[PDB]
């Protein structure tokens, strides 16, 4: 996790 996280 942490790629560019909009969730």
Same mark, same amino acid.
């Given at each position: +996790?942490?790629l560019?996280?909009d +969730?």
């Amino acid at each position: +996790f942490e790629l560019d996280k909009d +969730f």
